[PDB]
Write a structure and sequence with these properties.
The structure is a homodimer.
Chain A: E1 5-10, E2 24-34, H1 39-43, E3 52-53, E4 57-62, E5 77-78, E6 87-92, E7 107-108, E8 112-116, E9 167-169, E10 174-176, E11 226-228, E12 231-233, E13 241-243, E14 247-249, H2 251-257, E15 277-278, E16 287-288, E17 296-304, H3 307-310, E18 318-325, H4 334-340, E19 346-347, E20 351-354, E21 370-371, E22 381-386, E23 408-412, H5 419-429, E24 454-455, E25 458-463, E26 467-472, E27 486-492, E28 506-510, E29 522-525, E30 532-539, E31 553-554, E32 558-561, E33 571-579, E34 582-588, E35 599-607, H6 636-650, E36 662-666, E37 670-674, E38 681-689, E39 704-707, E40 722-725, E41 731-734, E42 745-754, E43 760-765, H7 766-772, E44 774-777, E45 783-788, E46 791-793, E47 804-808
Chain lengths: 809, 809
């Protein structure tokens, strides 16, 4: 019945009293921030006549509210046309709340239900939103009281208050459905979407929530689809039109309800027609737009100071007022402004542009056509461009596109706006005799900048490893004085796309020589080898004469490439041995390729064992034997030291040409070395390479030391150990040295023992063995003895050999 | 004998051949980067006559070098006057090296020894640097071959080559000292610092390394302190002077050895006198400087493009040439340039300054006094200042400090340099009629900028929570046209120190109104509450007239403070209960104080237990009982939701004014609550506060829920359980309810059993107990029975009571 628009209530229980004359809310109902409220105030407060909310219901921090069983005892239908971030029912941070208690709630047509952060509210898990919501899968009910902490008691089940009611399943829990401990959900047997009554018989289909009589559209308490004159209908009668997607009102009635921009397109009296539809003065029909929507925006004198300030005028076509641009802190604002401004076609007031240090061009007014100037600046000025430090192009809204009915233009203190553009604008405007001098006079605008940009062509280029010399043709300063100097912009551009005038570039001044020959030239230095550089030049040609054509000149962006140099040393060289005659090497590409990497030059050299291990006794002073490589591969002073030695290595180059260095070339970053000796150390040099036949050469070495795996039977003693007895209790035992041991042999451990007793061992060094060709045994009891021999090499212990038996008498 | 200056050898074994005519090196000997070298080349190469190196010895990547026993068989003394980063002997990354082998090395007077990354070099740990170095604690010997991997064999100990030698301790290892397997260290018994001979008798004290005859200074092979004519002396004879800290040469001899800037101060013929000493044309004595050192620097035409380019001229006083300044990319270069330039007093050539976009002032020439202009720019120009976009002050090198003998000055295209400074410079120079017009004419320099800075005083200030209104006195534009507008710089400065003109400031343009009243004014907005802002204003007053005094005006930096507002909600509230009647609360300060925090308002409210737990049976459908608080304290859609509710709370304020809210004020960020009930829940609201008597008020609540600890004996049943028998086998057992249970009682578990058999239990709800005041027992065999009762509350189980005995017949 009553319109009752969307309303918000805060801070006062008395403020709640604006719902006495309310029946259905044509919006959203918000109740929030109730600090000075107790249970006594809410116990005696009720709104029984409220029965429908259109948009959504929000409750937030309403102190002292125990339950909603008294506030909304008849709230049946929540339309949910407009959603609070997708939620039609929000109950957030509500102390003293215990149960939702909406016994008369029939359905929620659209929207999710969010009930979060109510540490005292429970009695929620005992209800199903399936009968209420069409999709109760979007509900977000977390943070409340623990479900098992409170007993979700419905009037049935146990010895509760009284008569029970129906039970339903929501998420596999076929349990009783109850709102509170006294009132439970009204569930009646009939197909979905049909309100019922006290008798239980479900009413007419168009009914929603409840009804007074069965099978009667006029008896509905809330029309499901459309409402009109106490009747429920699928669509409005032909004499009416839809409103708020929930009621029917005549064209005049809905026109009065919105009392200029409202429209009734497609059977719906909306506040504004959507894109492509508009109306001006005819009957209230949103007809199709021709090619665009002529949106009209009204501002008195809108001052623009940034992109956001101009974002208000987006989509505007006819501006009813004046514009005052002032953009000093921005940068590259042309695209953003063109996004915001540029659909404007007519400006009723003046246009002014002051102190726009960031406005390179006025090209964001492409569709600007008319400046009527009904309201104009003091002194009778319509276009007022003043103090623009760098404004060159002035845009393309010229050549009969413009017309200015009344007022004069005023260009002052625009140094980089040469007078040809302003004179062209005056010519195409059609008003020339309206103004006078001192308004477009020179000495303030038109100097400095150029009008006709000439072209300077590079004559000579020389490229070095870290230096580029350029020479362009000499450009005479036309006018005699015309003090000029060139400025070269050079930057590092990996690709062949670059933009002029814009920082990223490197600027370098060059004064031209005073002669006819020896063109200006320039020598860029400190450039990385094999790097593409974008270079161009520009003439400054600043002059002070009154009437003179500036005619600045510049050059196209040209891309040059420096000569390649030797690359850096390979990094992280890892060597391993998976066999007794093979080596595997891996590494990483150099940190500075300095060209196109082609391959890696790998050299390996066999290293002879040091003479230290040869001539000395090893029966005493044992050492830690070397092990084969098994690497798993499947502060300021120190830094200065490494930096100095890196600078030393920077000048190191390599010409790609028991001790014999063997070389190979490997395309990938991994190498396999074969044909190596067993248990012999090798030094590996790895140099990254590129096109070095004509270049300085390959990189420097990154040598590592790798030892191959020992052989299993390289220590085996050839032949059989021989014996020679003597009459003086001594015996000589002779055995031949192994032919190819693991590097070298160290000692001989001979095991001898008399038959029956324990075993004895003896260590003999190489010199002692070679002195007599074997070992001597003396001062032993007579009898039959047995002896065994074994060789020991750098790899480790050898293999025992066949025993020899001798006799002593 | 031979001078043999410091030399570096690279890349060629033949390049090593520059030491045949060398006896003592007057510098450092570097041997590095020997790629194409094998052991055969070095086996037949020796330098027996080299016996001393002054600075240091460096070896780096000399392939094929096995030992230095043949390269330097007589190198005895390393002076170490100049150190390679503190090291006198460096051997880095040396493949094929096996042993250092410096048998004749006597001592290293100064410097550490570094031997790193020699995977094949060993035979180092068997030597002591104590007899060689005065402090062998600075040695850095890591990364070589493992000490235990190779046998440090000296000619003694085991069955080595031959005659042994002495043993010494270095780091607690009293072991033999040996250079190689054939030659060991020469150690002779005598006090330190005394060379000995083959006989072993230590020679004269002045001897070092070795000697030919004992007790003879003329027999030394290398003089320890000073050398002169084959004699070793502590100091030079009076007819000579020191050189390189190692020899004596006459004044004429050392003058010829340095053949202009050399000096012989304090008995040492140095290449240049230190700070405070200099000589010009007299005898070669570095006398004391008067107040500064007149360092003279010669440059032809030095072009400066950055601070580093000007750092060459540091410390220069008399510049012999011309200077061409060009600083376009820098910022705030005045201090750095004053550090570099500023000691210059005379410039023989011209001075030119072109395109210096970063040169605000010429104040970095404080000591500049004369510009002779021997070499001068074309057109007879000595001072050539051109195209300086923002150059105002021109420095303080004026007022008779300057004089220009010949040439003219030329100031052009300096917009921000008003003509008064240039005219003053011309007046103090003394040359006015030398020049003419078109060289200091207006229309290029002197416009835009001001000369006499006026003062604008703020008239009115109004401060709001997030808005500041200012009004300053109206400044008429003197000259009629004089188009002017004010610019206000405002920034957030916590303290009262700030610098003008410099970005950090926020710029805002203000056009002055066209009237006599209503001073210009400005309204800064979007400002944080209770934040100090530095504000000042500046008049632009740009004009185009020929002869007019610009007379710009600005205002002093004034600091304003905005009004305070309510603070944010306290964060991270943690509540706990350490007792049955106390609560402890902690939190954190608000993220935005919005003033000076004074205290926290803490409210607590007792929460009654929900009526759900009262009227329902608890013998079935058990729940999870609540637990007392024991907290240990010793996506886009969600974010938008929280943001919207934070915006809702932003307008929430709190006036600092079974259900009773009790309030308190706490200065610290922690509160203690006492006098609470046992096992009763409490809601705690915490609001940060500040001076809110006149402000909008305190912050919003941050309530938490806390339950006190349960009482130990609150469930105890008062009195004694009574019994009443009946003739129909039934008995009634009555017990009184506990007076103050933990919240509420839930059920009664009564335990009864016949004497002899097992025990039985029975559950009774509150309603059943209250129906008859107790429990009933029926249908039991006759006999003497005993029963016990217990109470159960929300906290948990209670305490058992005294039993009651009854009889059935």
């Amino acid at each position: 019945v009553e319109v009752c628009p969307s309303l918000d209530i805060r801070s006062e229980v008395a403020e709640l009293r604006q719902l006495e004359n309310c029946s259905v809310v044509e919006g959203h109902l918000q109740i929030l921030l109730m600090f000075t409220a107790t249970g006594e105030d809410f116990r005696g407060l009720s709104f029984p006549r409220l029965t429908q909310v259109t948009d959504y219901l929000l409750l937030f921090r309403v102190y002292g509210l125990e339950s909603l069983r008294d506030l909304f005892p008849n709230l049946a239908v929540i339309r949910g046309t407009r959603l609070f971030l997708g939620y039609a029912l929000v109950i957030f941070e509500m102390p003293h709340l215990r149960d939702v208690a909406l016994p008369a709630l029939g359905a929620v047509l659209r929207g999710a239900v969010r009930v979060e952060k109510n540490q005292e509210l429970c009695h929620l898990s005992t209800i199903d939103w399936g009968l209420l919501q069409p999709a109760p899968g979007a509900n977000h009910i977390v943070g409340n009281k623990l479900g098992e902490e409170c007993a979700d008691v419905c009037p049935g089940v146990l010895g509760a208050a009284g008569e029970p009611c129906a039970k339903t399943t929501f998420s596999g829990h076929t349990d009783y459905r109850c709102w509170t401990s006294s009132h439970c959900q009204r569930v009646c047997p009939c197909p979905h979407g049909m309100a019922c009554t006290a008798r239980g018989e479900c009413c007419h289909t168009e009914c929603l929530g409840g009804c007074s009589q069965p099978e009667d559209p006029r008896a509905c308490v809330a029309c499901r689809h459309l409402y009109f004159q106490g009747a429920c209908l699928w669509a409005c009668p032909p004499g009416t039109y839809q409103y708020e997607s929930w009621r029917c009102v005549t064209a005049e009635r809905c026109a009065s309800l919105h009392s200029s921009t409202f429209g009734i397109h497609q059977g719906s009296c909306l506040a504004q027609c959507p894109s492509g539809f508009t109306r001006n003065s005819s009957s209230i029909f949103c007809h199709k737009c021709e090619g665009l929507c002529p949106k009209e925006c009204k501002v008195g004198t809108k001052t623009i100071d940034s992109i956001q300030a101009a974002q208000d005028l987006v989509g505007c076509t006819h501006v009813e007022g004046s514009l005052i641009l002032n953009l000093r802190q921005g940068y590259n604002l042309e695209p953003q402004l063109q996004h915001s401004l540029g659909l404007v076609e007519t400006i009723t007031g003046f246009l002014k542009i002051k102190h726009s240090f960031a406005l390179v061009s006025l090209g964001f007014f492409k569709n600007l056509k008319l400046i009527r100037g009904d309201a104009m600046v003091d002194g009778n000025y319509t276009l007022y461009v003043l103090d623009n430090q760098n404004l060159q192009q002035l845009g393309s809204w010229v050549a009969a596109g413009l017309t200015i009915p009344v007022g004069k233009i005023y260009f002052a203190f625009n140094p980089r706006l040469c007078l040809e553009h302003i004179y062209r604008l005056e010519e195409v405007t059609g008003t020339r005799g309206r103004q006078n001098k001192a308004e477009i006079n020179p000495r303030t605008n038109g100097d400095r900048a150029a009008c006709q940009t000439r072209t300077l062509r590079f004559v000579s280029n020389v490229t070095e490893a870290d230096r580029i010399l350029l020479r362009w043709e000499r450009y005479e300063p036309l006018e005699a004085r015309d003090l000029l100097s060139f400025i070269v912009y050079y930057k590092e551009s990996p690709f062949q796309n670059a933009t002029e005038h814009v920082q990223s570039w490197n600027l370098l001044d060059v004064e031209l020589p005073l002669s006819r020959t020896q063109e200006p030239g320039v020598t860029l230095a400190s450039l990385k080898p094999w790097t593409q550089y974008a270079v161009f030049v520009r003439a400054i040609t600043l002059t002070t004469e009154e009437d003179s054509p500036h005619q600045g000149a510049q050059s196209p962006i040209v891309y040059l490439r420096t000569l390649p140099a030797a690359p850096t040393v390979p990094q992280d060289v890892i060597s391993t041995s998976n066999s007794s005659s093979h080596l595997l090497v891996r590494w990483k590409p150099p940190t500075q390729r300095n060209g196109n990497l082609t391959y890696y030059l790998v050299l390996w050299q066999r290293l002879a064992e040091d003479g230290d291990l040869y001539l000395n006794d090893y029966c005493h002073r044992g050492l830690r034997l070397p092990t084969s490589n098994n690497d798993p591969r499947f502060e300021a002073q120190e830094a200065s030291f490494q930096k100095k030695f890196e600078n030393f290595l920077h000048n190191a180059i390599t010409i790609p040409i028991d001790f014999e260095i063997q070389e190979d070339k490997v395309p990938r970053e991994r190498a396999v070395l074969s044909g190596l000796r067993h248990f012999t150390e090798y030094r590996i040099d790895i140099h990254a390479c590129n096109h070095a036949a004509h270049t300085v050469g390959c990189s420097a070495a990154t040598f590592v030391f790798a030892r191959t795996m020992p052989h299993r039977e390289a220590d085996g003693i050839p032949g059989k150990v021989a014996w020679e007895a003597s009459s003086k209790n001594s015996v000589l035992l002779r055995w031949l040295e192994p032919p190819d041991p693991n590097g070298l042999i160290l000692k001989y451990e001979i095991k001898y023992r008399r038959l029956g007793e324990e075993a004895t061992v003896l260590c003999v060094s190489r010199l002692r063995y070679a002195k007599f060709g074997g070992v001597h045994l003396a001062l032993l009891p007579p009898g039959n003895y047995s002896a065994r021999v074994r060789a020991t090499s750098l790899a480790g212990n050898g293999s025992w050999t066949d025993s020899v038996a001798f006799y002593i008498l």
